[PDB]
Amino acid sequence: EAIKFLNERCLKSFPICHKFFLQLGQIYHSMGNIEMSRETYLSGTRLVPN
């Protein structure tokens, strides 16, 4: 759970990278919350198509 905040903050600011999104998704999967993970993935796609 302590990851998420950092991801929300630091990834958003400077890097804006795909790997981060993937990591987040993985984390979500690990702790159930599938819908949330899906949403995150979608967001990532929207932001970084390639």
mmCIF file of C-alpha atoms in Angstrom:
data_model
loop_
_atom_site.group_PDB
_atom_site.id
_atom_site.type_symbol
_atom_site.label_atom_id
_atom_site.label_comp_id
_atom_site.label_asym_id
_atom_site.label_seq_id
_atom_site.Cartn_x
_atom_site.Cartn_y
_atom_site.Cartn_z
ATOM 1 C CA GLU A 1 0.000 0.000 0.000
ATOM 2 C CA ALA A 2 2.889 2.438 0.684
ATOM 3 C CA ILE A 3 3.922 2.349 -3.016
ATOM 4 C CA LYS A 4 0.780 3.866 -4.423
ATOM 5 C CA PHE A 5 1.203 7.376 -3.040
ATOM 6 C CA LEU A 6 4.721 7.662 -4.444
ATOM 7 C CA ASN A 7 3.520 6.489 -7.855
ATOM 8 C CA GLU A 8 0.712 9.048 -7.784
ATOM 9 C CA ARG A 9 3.198 11.789 -6.914
ATOM 10 C CA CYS A 10 6.671 11.207 -8.423
ATOM 11 C CA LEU A 11 5.835 9.285 -11.640
ATOM 12 C CA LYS A 12 3.265 11.965 -12.560
ATOM 13 C CA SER A 13 5.757 14.837 -12.127
ATOM 14 C CA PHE A 14 8.988 14.032 -14.048
ATOM 15 C CA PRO A 15 9.232 10.579 -15.746
ATOM 16 C CA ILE A 16 5.649 9.972 -17.115
ATOM 17 C CA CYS A 17 6.767 6.463 -18.207
ATOM 18 C CA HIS A 18 4.975 3.240 -19.147
ATOM 19 C CA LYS A 19 6.945 0.884 -16.906
ATOM 20 C CA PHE A 20 5.582 2.722 -13.871
ATOM 21 C CA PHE A 21 2.014 2.117 -15.018
ATOM 22 C CA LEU A 22 2.774 -1.570 -15.546
ATOM 23 C CA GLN A 23 4.249 -1.795 -12.054
ATOM 24 C CA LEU A 24 1.157 -0.130 -10.599
ATOM 25 C CA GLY A 25 -1.082 -2.580 -12.447
ATOM 26 C CA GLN A 26 0.946 -5.505 -11.125
ATOM 27 C CA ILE A 27 0.658 -4.156 -7.585
ATOM 28 C CA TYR A 28 -3.102 -3.809 -7.977
ATOM 29 C CA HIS A 29 -3.341 -7.382 -9.258
ATOM 30 C CA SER A 30 -1.336 -8.610 -6.273
ATOM 31 C CA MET A 31 -3.795 -6.892 -3.861
ATOM 32 C CA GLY A 32 -7.005 -7.906 -5.715
ATOM 33 C CA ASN A 33 -8.565 -4.631 -6.988
ATOM 34 C CA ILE A 34 -8.829 -5.679 -10.650
ATOM 35 C CA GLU A 35 -11.139 -2.899 -11.830
ATOM 36 C CA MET A 36 -8.771 -0.262 -10.462
ATOM 37 C CA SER A 37 -5.838 -1.930 -12.212
ATOM 38 C CA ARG A 38 -7.771 -1.978 -15.482
ATOM 39 C CA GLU A 39 -8.584 1.713 -15.100
ATOM 40 C CA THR A 40 -4.924 2.498 -14.462
ATOM 41 C CA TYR A 41 -3.920 0.546 -17.563
ATOM 42 C CA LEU A 42 -6.483 2.437 -19.633
ATOM 43 C CA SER A 43 -5.156 5.747 -18.325
ATOM 44 C CA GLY A 44 -1.608 4.716 -19.209
ATOM 45 C CA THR A 45 -2.708 3.771 -22.717
ATOM 46 C CA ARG A 46 -4.433 7.130 -23.126
ATOM 47 C CA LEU A 47 -1.290 8.928 -21.969
ATOM 48 C CA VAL A 48 1.367 6.753 -23.673
ATOM 49 C CA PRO A 49 -0.144 4.987 -26.752
ATOM 50 C CA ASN A 50 3.265 3.698 -27.896
#
